Design a protein around this ligand. Structure first.
Ligand SMILES: Cc1ccc(NC(=O)c2cccc(N3CCOCC3)c2)cc1Nc1ncnn2cc(C(=O)N[C@@H](C)c3ccccc3)c(C)c12
Length: 338
């Protein structure tokens, strides 16, 4: 019950509202494809993502639902906002496709560095905006766990936006050590570790830890931060992980000031606070927002938290049709922000 319209671009069929004009394949897939388009109704450039077989399996179905639920709840200036969700289906019975619309960004952070290494005052603005989005997200028990340059995009102007599944840079390069081999219990500081990795690259132009595998990755990490202290080992519950770790040639911690020569010493001190092996002593997004490095931008009366998000459904074990149905209600009940 708008004006829809087919378009076999890509190699897949796209049935979208007439308001969405100028469909341009942005690329990729596995979980679906995105196109750059123009919103006739708001006169704005947008990205339209059509999911690949949203309800093909129980994992597809839960994936779909999990994303809708999240986006619909996302209201922050540093987090990708859901502009519109739509389906060519008029009934739940013929519900087989789902599309998600967002603003079109200027570019990712991936390329921003590929072009080169940015200014310090430019890095502060970026890292601050990322951390601001993480306070929000983290406040509602949401962990990104997938932080990497391509999942960071910049506003029409210069507003940073966190997204996911952004369209060969390994996400493992930014993964915190504790979740890099089942290692053990992990919290949201897993995201902070990633941040420190992204910040370093932006400062240096090079990938901080470009491991070729999980084994090599950890090796690259323990080389910089050094092998686990006997205090950290006290908190490792797995006997195998313990043996493995202890059986490594003990590496000492490097002085970041040495690794990052010429870098803002405030920028360096933060990095020392983020790239900590013990998830328990890692700086949180909120604490880092108060760090001197961002005194220029910090504004504790403008760094908001999120309102409670219920993720009970994650626990649930339903059927394809129950996730599908639930996804339907979610599409229907959608209220366009402005
Ligand atoms: C259209 C949509 C629909 C759904 C979700 N889904 C999500 O972003 C999600 C999915 C799950 C979780 C989260 N989180 C967000 C934050 O923290 C919790 C996790 C978030 C994303 C999107 N957007 C995009 N999806 C994929 N790629 N992509 C590239 C650009 C973009 O502007 N390229 C520039 C650089 C660009 C500019 C010109 C030409 C091409 C590209 C944009 C806007 C997207």
């Amino acid at each position: 019950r708008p004006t829809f319209y087919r378009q076999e671009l890509n190699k897949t069929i796209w049935e979208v509202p007439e308001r969405y004009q100028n469909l341009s394949p942005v690329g990729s897939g596995a979980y679906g494809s995105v196109c750059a388009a123009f919103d006739t109704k708001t006169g704005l450039r947008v990205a339209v993502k059509k999911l690949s077989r949203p309800f093909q399996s129980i994992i597809h179905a839960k994936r779909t639902y999990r994303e809708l639920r999240l986006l619909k709840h996302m209201k922050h200036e540093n987090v990708i906002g859901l502009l519109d969700v739509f389906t060519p289906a008029r009934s739940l019975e013929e519900f087989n496709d789902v599309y998600l619309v967002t603003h079109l960004m200027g570019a990712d952070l991936n390329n921003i560095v590929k072009c080169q290494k940015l200014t310090d005052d430019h890095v502060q603005f970026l890292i601050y905006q990322i951390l601001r989005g993480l306070k929000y997200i983290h406040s509602a028990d949401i962990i990104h766990r997938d932080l990497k340059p391509s999942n960071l995009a910049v506003n029409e102007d210069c507003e940073l936006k966190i997204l996911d599944f952004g369209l060969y840079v390994a996400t493992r390069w930014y993964r915190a050590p504790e979740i890099m081999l089942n290692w053990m219990h992990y919290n949201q500081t897993v995201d902070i570790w990633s941040v420190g990795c992204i910040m370093a690259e932006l400062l240096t132009g090079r990938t901080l830890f470009p491991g070729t595998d999980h084994i090599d990755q950890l090796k690259l990490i323990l080389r910089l931060v050094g092998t686990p202290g006997a205090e950290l080992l006290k908190k490792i519950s797995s006997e195998s992980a313990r043996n493995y770790i202890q059986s490594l040639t003990q590496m000492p911690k490097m002085n970041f000031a040495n690794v990052f020569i010429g870098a803002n010493p405030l920028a360096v001190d933060l990095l020392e606070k983020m790239l900590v092996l013990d998830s328990d002593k890692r700086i949180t997004a909120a604490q880092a927002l108060a760090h001197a490095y961002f005194a220029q931008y910090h504004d504790p009366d403008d760094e908001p938290v999120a309102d409670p998000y219920d993720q009970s459904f994650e626990s649930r074990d339903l059927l394809i049709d129950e996730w599908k149905s639930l996804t339907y209600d979610e599409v229907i009940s959608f209220v366009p922000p402005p």
